[PDB]
Each structure stands twice: as C-alpha cells, then as structure tokens.
Design a protein around this ligand. Sequence first.
Ligand code: B12
Ligand code: SF4
Ligand code: SF4
Ligand code: NI
Ligand code: NI
Lengths: 424, 313, 442
Amino acid sequence: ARNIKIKITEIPIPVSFAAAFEGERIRKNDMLAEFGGNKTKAWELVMCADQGEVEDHKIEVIGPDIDTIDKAPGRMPLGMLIKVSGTNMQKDFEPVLERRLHYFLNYIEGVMHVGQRNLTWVRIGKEAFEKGFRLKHFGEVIYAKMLDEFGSVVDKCEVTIITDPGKAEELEGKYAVPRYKERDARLESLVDEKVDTFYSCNLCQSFAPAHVCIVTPERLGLCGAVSWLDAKATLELNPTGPCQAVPKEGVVDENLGIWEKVNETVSKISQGAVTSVTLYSILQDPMTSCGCFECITGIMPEANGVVMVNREFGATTPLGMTFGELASMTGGGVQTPGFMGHGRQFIASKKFMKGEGGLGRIVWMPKELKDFVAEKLNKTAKELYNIDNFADMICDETIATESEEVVKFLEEKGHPALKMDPIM
Amino acid sequence: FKKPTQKFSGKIGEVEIGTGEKALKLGGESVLPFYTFDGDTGNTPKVGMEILDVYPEDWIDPLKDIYKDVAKDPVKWAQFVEEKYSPDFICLRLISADPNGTDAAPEDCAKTAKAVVEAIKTPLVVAGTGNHEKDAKLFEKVAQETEGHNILLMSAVEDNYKSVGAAGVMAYNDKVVAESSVDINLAKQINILMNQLGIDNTKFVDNVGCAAGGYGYEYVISTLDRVKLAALGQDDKTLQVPIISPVSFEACKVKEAMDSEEDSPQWGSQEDRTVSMEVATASGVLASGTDAVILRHPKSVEVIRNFIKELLG
Amino acid sequence: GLNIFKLTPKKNCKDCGFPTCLAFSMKVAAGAVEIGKCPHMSDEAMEKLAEATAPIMKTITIGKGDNEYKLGGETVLFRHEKTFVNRNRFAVAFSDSMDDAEVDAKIQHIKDVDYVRIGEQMKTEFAAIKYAGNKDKYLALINKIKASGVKVAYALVCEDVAVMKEALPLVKDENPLVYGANKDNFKEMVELVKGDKLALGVKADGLEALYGLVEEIQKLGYKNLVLDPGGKSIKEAFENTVQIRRINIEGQDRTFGYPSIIFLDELTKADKFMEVALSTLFTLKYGSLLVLSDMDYSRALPLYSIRQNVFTDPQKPMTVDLGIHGINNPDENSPVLCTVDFALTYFLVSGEVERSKVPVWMVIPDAGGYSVLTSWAAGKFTGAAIADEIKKCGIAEKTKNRTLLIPGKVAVLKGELEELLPDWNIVISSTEAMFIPKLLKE
Ligand code: B12
Ligand code: SF4
Ligand code: SF4
Ligand code: NI
Ligand code: NI
C-alpha cells in the first residue's frame, strides 16, 4: 500500500557468487550434470504476466533434483521458466531481462551458462554440489538479483526450474516457442511510421563531442549494438542514462526524414554543434558519425550511386580511398555530405537512403560483405520490383576495383542506379 | 577590424563555502576565464592549501622540513598554515580513513575534523578517501560533528551521492562536491541526480576530474572547456555550477615531481620540480574554467595567486 | 569536400597524385594536398577555388631540415572542436649585453635539457638573439652559438635595419626568423626578407596599430609573417594574444591569420615559476612561439609534457609504448599486469599503483590503441594476443612469479588464458579502478 521495497543484501546460496567467476573452465572430467546442448533439450524464458499469476519468491523444481544423479556425469533436460510482473513491466523488456540471465548463471562458481532460447546448455561442477548446491538455488540467484538490477520494472519474480523430460517439452511449446515468435515478429515488422517516439544515444560523445545517434526501428545505432527496443529499455531502467526519448512531432519533410522536434533535440544534445539533420538522406544535412561504425558508404558520382566498404576490408575502394582514409573524415561527429558511417544491419533497410533514391544506389560492396547481407539485400530490393538477385548486379572487389571498370560493369548489367535521377 | 563581440546567455551560479568574514564565493562568471575584455568574471578563482590528518610520510623532504613541529597535530598544522600563508581555504584530507592503509573508524576521523574546524577562521574543505563505500559512512559522521561552519564535503560520486548529499547539504546545511570522471555527460548526469534529490545548483560545486600535466591532462582540459561552453554558450542550467579541481592530489604524486636528486641527478632540484609541476597544472586548469584549486607546496600558492592577480588586475 | 568536386573537371586522370577526383576533392578540404596539384582546373573555377579553400591561418616554416618547425595553421579555438594542428615552440632569449659566463650557462642548459618522452624529442627549439645596443658583440654572440653545436633554430630580434643587414647573412641559410618590422622600418624590412622568403616579425603598439601595420606589409605582397601580440603588462599581452586568434577564426579575418610570438622573459621579468605558469597559459591560449629567459628540467618537464597532451589529435587516441613497463625497481620475482595501451587506462592504473608498495611489472599487449572492452570487441585484446605477448616480451625470464593479473572487465578470457598459459596463475579483478590495490596486495 505504501510502495515500500525491501532489498536483500545476500544471495542465499552456499556457493560463492561474484562477477569474477564467469569465464571459468570446468574440467571435462569434473563436471557433474550437463543440461542441454545437442545432447538434451534445455531452454529459458522470461515472461511478463499479471500480478495474479506471479507469486513473490516461489522457486519450484519439477523433476529429479541434482542429488538424484549420483552416477557418472550425465545429462538431464532443463527448463527455466521465469515469470515477472510489475506496474510498468511490458513485453518489450523481456529480452533485456533474458539477456542478463546469461551472466547471472555464469557468476556462480562451478556453473557456466552459454546460449539463448532453446539453444542453451548449463553444466554443473562437482565443487558446487558437494557444497549443497541444488536446483532450488538456481531460482534464488535469479530472483534475488532480478529484483536488484530491474528494481524499477520488476515487482514480483517467480522462477520454476523444470527437469522432467515430459514437462520440459510441454512447457516449451506453450510458453517458450510462442513467445519467441512474438520477439521475431516485433523486431521484423516494426517500421518508423508505426512508432511515435525515436531515441537518442550519446555514449560515443567521449571522443566525438558533436555526435548524437538517432535510433529508429528501421535505423539502429552506428555501432550496431543499440536498437530501438534496446534504447527503449535503457531509458526505462536508467532515466538519466545515454538513451532519451525523441518525440516525432513536427514533420518538415517526410521523404528526407526532417522533423521539427528532431532538429530541436539534436542541437540540445550536441551542445549546439549540429542544428539541422536528416534521417533518410546522405547529401542534405546527414547524420554525424563517431568511429564505431563497421561499414561506411561513400558517394560515387560517376556511377550515379554510392560505394560501401567494411572495416575489415583492407584494400582500396573504387573511390580511391580505403576504410581508414574514409574514416578519418566521416568520423568525429562532423556532418560530411555524401559519406555516412552506419551499421552492418542498416544496409538492407527500407530507409537506407530513402531520400536519395533508395537501396538501389548501391553499386560496389566487398565480396565478404555482399555475401553476408545477400539474402536480406535481395529481399529488400524485391520491393523495388527489380529481379530478386540484386546482389548479382552489385559489383565486388573480385570483378573490379577501379572506377572506369565498375561503370562498364554496371552498364552491361542494367544496374538500376544508372537509370535513376542524378544523385548529385 | 571588428572587436569580437562574444555574448553568452548563461551564467555560472555562486556557491558560498564557510562562514564569517572569511567565507569565499565561487563562480558567477558569464565569460570564459580571465576574459576581462569580454565581460564580467564573477569571482576571482580561489587557491587552497592541503593538510593531512596524519603525519605526511610520502611527502617530499622539503615539504617535511617546512612542517616540522606542526605536522604531527592537525589542529596545530591548520593554524600554522592559516597564519603563515593565509590560504583562501584549507583542505583536510582524511588519509587515516582509507581502507587501503591505516584504516580507522569514521568516528575517529570526524573527531579530528571537529577540532580543526573550530580552530581556524578560513573555510574548510574535508576531502574523503577514494572508497565510495567508506565515504558514505565517513561523511555522515563528519558532517554531524562539524555542524554550523558550512564546510565543503568532497568526492561525492554517483554511488554515494544519496548518502553524502543527504548527510551533507540537506541535513546539516553544508556544501557537497559532485564528482564525475572527466566527462561532460557524466558531469551532467551527477548534477541532475543532485537536483532531483532536492539540491539546487547553489548548494553543490562540481569536480570534473583532475590530472597531472602529462598524465591524461588533455582529457581534463577538454572536459573543462566543454562544460564551460555548454554552461554559458548553450545556457545549460544543469552545468552552471562552479568547478573545483584538486591539483596537489595528482600533480605532486608523479615521478617528475617526487624523484629526488639521488634518483634522477640530471633532473636537478626536487623542490623546484614539485613547485613547477603544481604551478603548470594549476595554471592550465584555471585557464580552462576551474574556480578553485588545491595546492600543497606553499611556494605554489604564491605563484598562482600572483598568476591570478596579474591576469585579472 | 563535395563543394569543390563540382568545380573539379571530374576526369580521374591521376595528375594530382591521387586516384580519383573525389579523393582529391575531400583531402583538399582538409588541407593536406591543397589545390596546386591539379593542372587541369579551369581558370574560371581555379580563381574561385583558390580563395574559398585558402586556410584562414597561414602555416609558417622556420628552420632547416632537422630544425623544421611549422607555426600556425589552426582552425579551431578549442581542441575538442577539432585537433590543434601545430604545437607551440619554446625559445631561450640571448642578448648581446650578457656576460660570457652567463651565455655559456645558457648554451649548456639548451644542450643539457634533451630527452625523449613517448617517442617525441623534447628540447629547446629556438634561440632568440636580441640586439641590446652594441653591434660588435652582437655578431660575436651569433657566431658563438653557431660554433656551440646547439641544434636549435635562430630568431634574430633586432629593430635596427642597419644592424640586421649585417646580422642576417650569418644565419641566413638557416631559414631564421627576422623580427623587428615596425611602423617606420617595414618597407626596408620586407625587401630584406622578400628574396629568401624568411618569416618576418611585426611589432606595433596595440591591436589597431598592429592590424594596420600588417595590411601595409600585405599590400607590398609579402604574407610570410609572424605577428607579435605585444603588451605593457601580462593582462594586456594575454588580451592581445586571444583577440588576434578570435578575430582571425571567429571573425574570419585573414589579416590576423598569422602565428604569434610572445616574449615571456620580459613580462615575467626573469621569473622561473611565473614563466612556467604563463607558458602553460599561452600553450592553451594561442601562443605559437614562446620566448623564455632560460631552460632547465624544472621548466621542461611540465611544459613539454603538457604540450604533448594538448596537441594530440582527439580523434586518434593517445597511445603509450609497447613492451614491458616495470614499475618501481623491476626485479627477478614479482606478479605482472596487463593493459591495452590506451594511455588513459595505463595512467589510471599506473596512477593507482604509483605507490610502488607491491612491485609489479605491467606487461602491455598490443590491443590496438583502444580501451579494454573495445579491444576485446575488436578481437585485439584476446587470449591469443595476451598469450603470444608473453612469448614476445619474454616476461618469464624477467620475473619468476607465475601470478598473472588481468583487467577485471575481461571475463571470458580468464578460462581461455589459463588454457594457453597453464603454469601461469591468472587473477581476474573487478572493472572498477578502485580494486587495483586490493589484489595488488596479494
Ligand atoms: C570510446 C569507444 C570506442 C572507440 C575507442 C576510441 C578510444 N578513444 O579508444 C572506438 C570507435 C574505437 C570504438 C569502437 C567500437 N566499439 Co566502442 N566504445 C567506446 C566507449 C565509448 C568507451 C570506452 C572506454 O574508454 N571506456 C572506459 C575505460 C576507462 O574503461 P577500460 O578501458 O575498461 O578500463 C577500466 C577497467 O578495465 C579497469 N582496469 C583496467 N586494467 C585493470 C587492472 C586491474 C588490476 C584492475 C583492478 C582494473 C583494471 O580500470 C579501468 C579504468 O576504470 C564504450 C562505451 C562503454 N559503455 O564502455 C564503447 C563500447 C565499449 N564500444 C562497443 C563496441 C561493440 C564497439 C565496436 C566493436 C562496434 C563495431 N564496429 O561492431 C567497435 C570496434 C572498432 C574496431 N576497430 O573494431 C560496445 C561494447 C559491446 C561489447 N559487448 O563488446 C560499447 C559499450 C558501446 C555500446 N554500443 O554499448 N569504441
Ligand atoms: S554509436 Fe552506439 S554507443 Fe555510440 S552513441 Fe550511437 S548508439 Fe550510443
Ligand atoms: S589532377 Fe585533377 S582531374 Fe586529374 S585526378 Fe586529380 S583532381 Fe581529378
Ligand atoms: Ni558510436
Ligand atoms: Ni563511432
């Protein structure tokens, strides 16, 4: 009634718990129980349920306990179902809670957890079991520190550890598998038009003071480690942190991505260094770049398109400049028209240079980079109605490296970028 | 030509440390430091001297020779510094409280601080240890013992800002230093947390980090430049707070200032290098936007005070 | 960048030495190659390009090959906005009205103070020779310093055209600095330096007089100048130094786009601890050539260390040397520590172990000049890199203590390190900098 929360200082487990213990190695002959892998089925899930279904601090072990396997090191099914309820807990925060569960289990001595969803497997060492380690302690570690780290979104946490083969398969099909569907569909089907607030990150201003990253569902961070959902949860967990809400109010230009509020909130975060910005263009007031970007796209005027190059690529681009040479001017939080540093996932987005013609402006990519995004790039270009194999039209390092050679290759290929209106 | 007309919409707030006629004011400037030609430089930057609650064992021999018969007793040490060098403020670093060394209970250290604050007229700045956990308990007892003198509690990081700020500004009506790690965003974050807790800009000063010349110094210079430009140029209300940077803490521990002639014969005198190290470090941070510095060697104070006086008058 | 590409003929003929016109387009905007390399430019665009791309502040080269120092070229007022390009230089003042013993002490000090810090040669760069009234001893003073063997540049400070006419040929071939142009001798001073393209120092009373005087020299056609702020007090000298730079940069005025020479020996009136303070101030406040009264390790150690930090490009993280860095009496048995040569983590860690209480030799594997987490993300600070670094530096021989300490935030490598280094005992810390001494106690 008074919204009073009492904190628990000590994790009630006999085995020592510390961040230092992760990354250890259990001897191949000193394992006790190996749950999961290709050996048996193991899975994990964090649920956002109503307060009725979640009872605070309930740890349930369904099936044989660790004390039952007295024989040689063997395998048992493992099911870790975590139910979480809170006043402001939503389904978008479930992946954040589940990601941290990997490090929660690794912090325990003799317990190492690697994997996500149904691809997980946890091995228990002899050292923990002889010290009274049980499957009930697994739920004590999660519950004690789920309330600790997520103390502003998690009111009650209920953990069930399932190790019965019959129940482990059954609960996966009604809770785990259906909820993985929602995660994939939410990430794939979310576009900029549907959302109403963008997010701004400024964690790279330690070396690029003028740099502000605007994160949208179709345009994640330059480093590639921050997305719209991640920034949404960062703002909730850390209201005064690097990620802050950016209202999408006031639309100067829909095609170029100009918004009245975005320009207002960019000049504030960058301390007035950058005042006008666009989200879907690289020529008119482009976004700034810090230096964490793995791929940088540069304009190639003679080909009526743009060239791309990844960080690992150590050769010379058709632009005449390598990645290091291009990174010396694109980075640093300066607005350089015609050049943009971005992530590896933004390549196959429908907002990749929407205001500059679209995705078809790509004319040259590294061979290793082209293969990675070939499946996604071809699908996105299919919406442009051209033949599906768009990557086949894109030139690579193997075919040519000089500007006059690649232009000839584009002439014969019927590349769409040539026929489009002049980019510059 | 055209005289540069640089107009800043911001203005740094004023924080008063101490009580009586010796109380000092920090901040108030609406222009860059020492830019008397641009506008109003609010309050002249202050220079403070550092003392210890224990005998200085690691200080250089020339410093030990100055504080011969007064270093043993902090009360005698504080009165000796005040009457001989007349610093703007005296910094009392509670070395005996750190867990890494001669760890002592917070009650013992607060008793030492109580005697010092009641034996001097100059404002006192009580510097804590490096440990975040101990500083929360240390400052709770220190601020209770030294009540009614408006001391400055130093090194209140994001970890213990709730404990230090509550036991500091709000409870016993003191001042608190909000310390960040050489970042404008981290400095901006800690200030927001203090404001949300109920402490406005007039009750706490900022510490954006400090370093010795040649040891990560440009990082401190960039941070000082950025916070000053944001506070004034961008009228950022969450950065319009005065800045104090302890120079003697970092500048006097380096190899170039502690090595004696026996260790490095070519480097020359030891006292000259110690003074020259603090003067160079303090002058550079003063030009970047620091409103108060802490110095150890008495000769450094005289040079910096002359340095401040020459540029402003 | 793309602004001048419109004016470029777009032929990709590689005549400028760069592969594509775009490659030539972006670099000249930075200012490295400049505009001359392209001969195929149309004169209609060449005239407009020459003025738009012209830097707001000229770069002045003084001295010969080894003593080659560039002054000026700044584009920003603060280093965080963009890198400071050219570092300021320090000079030792020499006057012909000085005793032979005094001059010998100055020469030895210039030669004595010479060391390398993080790969940069820290030494006095210039030797300002001043004319005090006796011409006969002035030429002797110049010749003595040449015969001394001090590897310094020359800056003759002489307002007398007659004396300068005889003093210049002695060190004319050294590309010296000819200082002394004032209101009533500039016409005869420009013609003296126009032939050999030597930097000319401009002197006047106040900014208005200085601004007008620079225009007269520029109207003659000579623009290789080293302006002198000038002032009767430290307060006025500081104002003039700042105003010259702000007028040039903020006001986009190219009349004041020249480096500043500041005589700190006269303002401080030969005060060592004041010289160091003012040298730091003008290192951070647009002083391009600072003239001191004497040089010694008391001045050199802070001033040269600070200058190294200020004039490092913020975009390129500053880096520390590689190899083993033994702290406080390296010996035959002690634990070892790992870092990522970010030069901030090193200083933050070394700034915690500087107590020397527990001797430890910090091995620094090449992590790419990045921080701990980004190096591991990049794959530079990995188990193989840490393991093979032990092979490279041979730390097994130096210390017989298998206790190996690694950065705390590096977590998964602890098991991986143990595999590649079985005999070595790995200790994994916390990522806070406060836990450095706890495990150092062992
Ligand atoms: C600056 C930065 C960059 C810059 C670095 C420039 C520079 N100045 O060095 C650049 C642009 C290179 C960069 C790049 C990338 N970055 Co980056 N980077 C950072 C950033 C902003 C700060 C790093 C830093 O200085 N941290 C602070 C320093 C002081 O900490 P530290 O070095 O760990 O040292 C401390 C401890 O280790 C400890 N310690 C050290 N030694 C010892 C010893 C003992 C005994 C003890 C007790 C303690 C101790 O004390 C030290 C001081 O407190 C972080 C943000 C963050 N949240 O950390 C992101 C961050 C680390 N970057 C990240 C990533 C992912 C990348 C990229 C891999 C992205 C990509 N391209 O895919 C790229 C890689 C580039 C490449 N070449 O491959 C992620 C890391 C994610 C992960 N799981 O790996 C972060 C968190 C950003 C994010 N998106 O969240 N980055
Ligand atoms: S690149 Fe990533 S870490 Fe850097 S500011 Fe943008 S979102 Fe933050
Ligand atoms: S010389 Fe001129 S036309 Fe030829 S490549 Fe260079 S910039 Fe292009
Ligand atoms: Ni970034
Ligand atoms: Ni970046």
